[PDB]
Design a protein around this ligand. Structure first.
Ligand code: MG
Ligand code: ZN
Ligand code: ZN
Ligand code: ZN
Lengths: 61, 49, 45, 56, 48, 57, 263, 67, 147, 113
RNA sequence: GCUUGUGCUGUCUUCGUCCA
């Protein structure tokens, strides 16, 4: 397989990916980074949506 | 973009606090490898002057 | 020909010395070799 | 091992394989094609083996 | 050309009975076998 | 520091991995057993062996 | 002439008093019980799979220290003295352990009760790991979480505590004589008064304290010895004592045979 | 890392008393009373259970490398 | 004179016993447009100036596998670098040296068990391996202790 | 690395005799006995048993080095008695003492069982 | 008769060990 084919297969399985702890942690980190970017831009509307999404994704055990 | 990147990386990697072509006369030993032999040694190293 | 294990999802696979070093299913860049099949014996001392 | 290959669609075309009828006498079926079905992810071999490929 | 070189071997007699090793030196009638159990290499006759 | 820091001893082969000294010679060497290391040099000739056994013993 | 008097008796420890024997004989008996009575212990570990967080040799060392029942170890032979190629049933006991955690939550403890005896000498009561009761889980060997498995095969051999401490049947042998110091074998350090600064021995009531007007007796020798033998469970206390005596007798008989055959 | 099988000094088996020790401490017993109830007389044995730090509970929190 | 006496039976029961790990690193360097190093098990025929150790513990990809006991001077990473061929193509039946050995041997004074082998790609996209070796060090005469 | 095998403390090589006896000519009727693969356990027992015999005028032992498992014993008897006979008598006497000790312990254990 | 495999930089820097 080529590198591009590997990336395509990984994206396909990510679309198929229901949940994975490593991927959930990565998604939460990316969401936190996006939230701080929105905070620095004084966007009070996006930050509410990002906070709601973070609350929904979180609550681990 | 390579200028700042290489300068910072070189100074942090080697400990010579200055430009790469002025290694002589620069203050050496500023950056050191973290001591990880035991937890107390790491804590002591992080608070050294 | 030789097995490998991903560093994140712990998925077993194999490589043919020509594929890119990558997990097939999660695309992680770090993989580990699997344990040898030889006998391992210890002296219990 | 090979269902996610782009060429696997044409590879599986025309192949003969043992199939579980379910309604079990195993029989042979002829592959008229494949069709990806989103939202129909199913366990293929284990719980983690999610698959969206379908064989017509 | 010493076909038993670099081959897994087991000891059947002496003070190391039943220990797995690998043959390292095969001059003759005295084989040097490294032991997997401790980190050492010992001489041993071929009959053993 | 002085010429008693190099003296010629007689070898006795022993197990384990440390040099062993009678404790009376720890004074001229200024040595103790808290981690010190010492150097050993082997003569390679009859003349040199005689010199060591007759002068530096 | 020698006498034995038992104070307390149990399966794991016996507290007895020896008398009319020399101090050397009692000390030699103590040393023999500590380091020359043969027992059975795991000596080789073949690790077929170990995905636990502990190192392979960590678990091997832990296994070697587990006490195994060694009642009939006399019938068993030493590994180096058995002419059989590899190991037979007459010079080794094979135990097998297989542990696994099922489910994606919780932690599984691996105990010594999981060690299953696979092969050994016929009808000999040896090899089984020692258990305090029928419901005692035993020594904790390892811990496992989901998808971690431990699968090993261990071989137990006969040996003495001189070679390695794992073959020692005893734990600690308390040894004591002359509680009141009539022989003056020790000189008591003190600050003000040596009598009230030193605790009384636990056997001080077993001997009459010296009279205030008594003179020193230079003709006396230590005569009564108090010793407690504690075992790890591989051997009973009486078995340890009797086998120590027998081992000492065998050693002396070997010396006698060497002397008689020397001429 | 995990409770030693034998006491270092004398050799008494203390590896089977960790769970019982934790159970006793759970019920409110003091450490000295808990050690006495397990029949650990010599202080050489008492230091083994008293000063043991259980690190395997921290190593087990890492995701296993295989499945 | 600052020595001390230790109980052998306590050492046997695990007193002051410890675990030792050492890691080795190696990577494939790029010297030109098509001059690359390769992780492989070098052969006595196609390569020249081999190390005096043994290459029999290497796998097909030139990397040792975890769980294998290693000794001093053994080869744990097999690497070769290309060399311009000589005039040996005269009459050699393909048995002419085209590569030079650049293998990584284990340290001469050390031995242990291969604990974990890591294979990945560096920043430049070339192969990159790390091998960790494990051994146990038991106290003995000469080891330093302190209160 | 240089640590010897632990079984060398008690396992006797074939070429090494268990018991070598050489006379001590400096004093009359004296022998020097070299025990191999033995330690204080047998030595102290034998020494304190022999010290009580009226016909034994000198008995002693020493372990030259703790790292080697052997000891050497010096024995010197009266004119009438050969030292080796005294050593044999000591061995037999200690064996009888141990035998009666074992018998008495078995009796007491059965009584208190 | 298929016959066995011998070779390693260099320069800085830092942190340590034993005396002092
Ligand atoms: Mg010093
Ligand atoms: Zn993966
Ligand atoms: Zn056998
Ligand atoms: Zn203890």
């Amino acid at each position: 397989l080529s590198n591009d084919e590997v990336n395509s297969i990984v994206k396909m399985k990510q679309s198929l990916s229901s949940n994975t702890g490593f991927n959930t942690v990565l998604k939460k980190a990316q969401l936190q980074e996006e939230l701080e970017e929105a905070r620095d831009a004084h966007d009070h509307e996006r930050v509410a949506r990002i906070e709601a999404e973070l609350k929904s994704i979180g609550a681990e055990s | 973009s390579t200028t700042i990147t290489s300068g910072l990386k070189y100074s942090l990697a080697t400990g010579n606090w200055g430009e790469q072509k002025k290694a002589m006369s620069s203050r050496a030993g500023v950056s050191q490898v973290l001591n990880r032999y035991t937890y107390s040694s790491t804590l002591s190293h992080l608070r050294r002057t | 020909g030789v097995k490998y294990t991903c560093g994140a999802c712990a998925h077993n696979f194999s490589l043919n010395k020509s594929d890119p070093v990558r997990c097939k299913e999660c695309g992680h860049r770090v993989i580990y070799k699997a344990r040898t099949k030889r006998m391992i014996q210890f002296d219990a001392r | 091992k090979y269902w996610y290959y782009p060429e696997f669609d044409d590879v599986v075309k025309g192949m003969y394989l043992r199939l579980n009828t379910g309604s079990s006498p195993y029989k042979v079926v002829e592959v008229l094609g494949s069709q990806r079905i989103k939202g129909s992810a199913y366990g293929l071999n284990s719980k983690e083996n999610n698959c969206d490929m379908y064989l017509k | 050309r010493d076909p038993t070189l670099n081959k897994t071997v087991k000891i059947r007699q002496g003070g190391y009975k039943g220990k797995i090793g690998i043959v390292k030196e095969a001059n003759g009638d005295r084989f040097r076998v490294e032991l997997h159990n401790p980190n050492k290499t010992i001489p041993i006759p071929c009959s053993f | 520091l002085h010429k008693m820091s190099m003296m010629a001893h007689r070898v006795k082969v022993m197990p384990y991995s440390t040099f062993r000294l009678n404790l009376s010679v720890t004074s001229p060497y200024n040595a103790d057993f808290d981690g010190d290391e010492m150097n050993l040099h082997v003569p390679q000739s009859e003349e040199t062996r005689a010199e060591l056994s007759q002068l530096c013993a | 002439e020698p006498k034995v008097n038992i104070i307390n008796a149990q399966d794991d420890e016996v507290e007895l008093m020896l008398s009319d024997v020399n101090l050397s004989l009692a000390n030699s008996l103590r040393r023999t019980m500590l380091a020359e009575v043969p027992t059975l212990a795991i000596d080789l570990v073949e690790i077929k799979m170990n995905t636990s967080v502990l190192a392979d040799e960590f678990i091997s060392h832990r296994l070697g220290l587990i006490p195994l029942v060694s009642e009939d170890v006399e019938e068993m032979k030493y590994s180096r003295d058995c002419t059989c190629e590899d190991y037979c049933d007459e010079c080794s006991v094979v135990l097998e352990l297989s542990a696994r955690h099922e489910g994606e939550e919780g932690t599984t403890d691996v105990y010594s009760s999981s060690l299953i005896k696979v092969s050994g000498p016929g009808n000999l009561n040896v090899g089984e790991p020692v258990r305090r009761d029928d419901y005692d889980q035993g020594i904790l060997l390892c811990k496992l979480r989901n998808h971690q498995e431990l699968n090993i095969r261990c071989i137990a051999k006969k040996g003495i505590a001189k070679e390695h401490a794992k073959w020692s049947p005893c734990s600690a042998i308390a040894f004591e004589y002359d509680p009141h110091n009539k022989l003056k074998h020790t000189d008591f350090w003190f600050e003000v008064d040596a009598k009230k600064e030193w605790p009384d021995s636990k056997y001080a009531t077993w001997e009459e304290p010296p009279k205030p007007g008594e003179v020193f007796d230079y003709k006396a020798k230590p005569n009564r010895f108090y010793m407690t033998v504690e075992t790890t469970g591989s051997l009973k206390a009486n078995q340890v004592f009797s086998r120590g005596i027998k081992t000492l007798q065998e050693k002396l008989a070997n010396v006698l045979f060497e002397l008689e055959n020397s001429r | 890392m995990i409770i030693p099988v034998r006491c270092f000094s004398c050799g008494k088996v203390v590896g089977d008393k960790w769970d019982a020790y934790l159970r006793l401490l759970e019920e409110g017993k003091q450490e000295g009373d808990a050690l006495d109830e397990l029949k650990l007389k010599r202080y050489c044995c008492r230091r083994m259970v008293l000063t043991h730090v259980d690190l395997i509970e921290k190593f087990l929190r890492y995701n296993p490398l295989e499945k | 004179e600052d020595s001390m006496i230790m109980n052998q039976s306590s050492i046997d029961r695990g007193l002051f016993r410890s675990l030792f790990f050492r890691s080795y690193m190696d990577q494939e360097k790029r010297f030109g447009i098509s001059i690359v190093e390769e992780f492989e098990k070098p052969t006595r025929a196609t390569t020249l100036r081999l190390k005096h150790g043994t290459y029999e513990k290497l796998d097909e990809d030139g990397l040792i596998a975890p769980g294998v006991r290693v000794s001093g001077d053994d080869i744990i990473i097999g690497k070769t670098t290309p060399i311009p061929p000589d005039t040996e193509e005269l009459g050699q039946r393909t048995k002419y040296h085209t590569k030079r050995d650049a293998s990584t041997p284990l340290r001469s004074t050390e031995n242990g068990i291969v604990d974990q082998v890591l294979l990945t790609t560096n920043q430049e996209g070339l192969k990159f391996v790390k091998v960790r070796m494990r051994t146990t060090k038991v106290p003995q005469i000469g080891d330093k202790f302190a209160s | 690395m240089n640590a010897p095998d632990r079984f060398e403390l008690f396992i006797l090589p074939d070429d090494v005799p268990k018991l070598k006896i050489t006379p001590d000519s400096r004093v009359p009727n004296c022998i020097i006995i070299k025990f191999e693969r033995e330690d204080h356990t047998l030595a102290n027992l034998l020494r304190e048993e022999l010290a009580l015999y009226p016909d034994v005028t000198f008995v002693a032992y020493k372990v030259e080095h703790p790292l080697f498992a052997n000891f050497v014993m010096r024995l010197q008897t009266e004119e009438g008695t050969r030292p080796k006979q005294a050593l044999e008598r000591a061995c037999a006497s200690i064996i009888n003492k141990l035998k009666t000790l074992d018998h008495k312990f078995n009796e007491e254990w059965n009584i208190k069982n």
